């Protein structure tokens, strides 16, 4: 119940535990979605902590996140996917993944248009 | 970039308002009491611009709008015009929020999920 601040974030972004999130409903393929986040000084959603990002339990439908398959799964920044964070489930043949609740990743062709989530970290 | 809040750690912050969703279904009175136990109130809608995140809310949830006059919030203030479209769903004196900027008239005794809000 103790009060603190959250951010810094741009005003039009949701802030939660010092990460900034923005939802985009205009459907784009994975690459176009990544480019859109980058144009906003951001990246596609990166899942690094179930506790610090527990708001993702409330995220419904299916959205691009920054997770890609190198033919291991890894993020845009080049870091690998930590274990016990996401359950990765096959769906459509492809090398990208859609976030869905709760902490699931559905494999999807990178060229399929989807909604997407951008995230900015503050540290 | 700026800071948002203040808010408690487990709440979403948007434009200096704090929001928390509660999945346990409760009637309007129990929901109000739950928010009060967290130094908060049920959702109050005052601005489509400051609260445009409410366009993204899925399903329907108790907010702090009641019929005693007009519809009014817990804090005694009146519902501002041109904020919510009010729709009759159940015989009731309470209202659920639904996107986008709708209020469903609902029996206060019906269990529903709810949204608490804190400001400053
Ligand atoms: C993380 C986030 C997810 C959603 C939106 N899900 C929902 O609304 C949702 C779905 N099932 C249950 C509850 C909720 C919910 C209820 C109240 C709020 C609150 F914020 F009022 F507390 C937030 C979520 C979703 O999944 N999409 C946007 C794709 C919306 C928001 C927010 F409204 F904040 F922007 C945040």
UniProtKB/Swiss-Prot annotation, chain A:
The chain holds residues 91 to 216 of 216 of the full protein. Induction: Up-regulated by interleukin IL15 in primary NK cells. The lineage of its organism: Eukaryota, Metazoa, Chordata, Craniata, Vertebrata. This is NKG2-D type II integral membrane protein. Residues 8-120 form the C-type lectin domain. GO terms for cellular component: cell surface; external side of plasma membrane; membrane; plasma membrane. Its main location: membrane. It is a single-pass type II membrane protein. One of its GO terms (molecular function) is signaling receptor activity. The keyword Cell wall biogenesis/degradation does not apply.
């Amino acid at each position: 119940l103790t009060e603190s601040y959250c951010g810094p974030c741009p005003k039009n972004w949701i802030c939660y535990k010092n990460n900034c999130y923005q939802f985009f409903d205009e459907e784009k393929n994975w690459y176009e979605s990544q480019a859109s986040c980058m144009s906003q000084n951001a990246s596609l959603l990166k899942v690094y902590s179930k506790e610090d990002q527990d708001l993702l339990k409330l995220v419904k439908s299916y959205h691009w996140m920054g997770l890609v398959h190198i033919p291991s799964w890894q993020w845009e920044d080049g870091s690998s996917l930590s274990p016990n964070l996401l359950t990765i489930i096959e769906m459509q043949k492809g090398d990208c993944a859609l976030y869905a609740s709760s902490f699931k990743g559905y494999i999807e062709n990178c060229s399929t248009p989807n909604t997407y989530i951008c995230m900015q970290r503050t540290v």
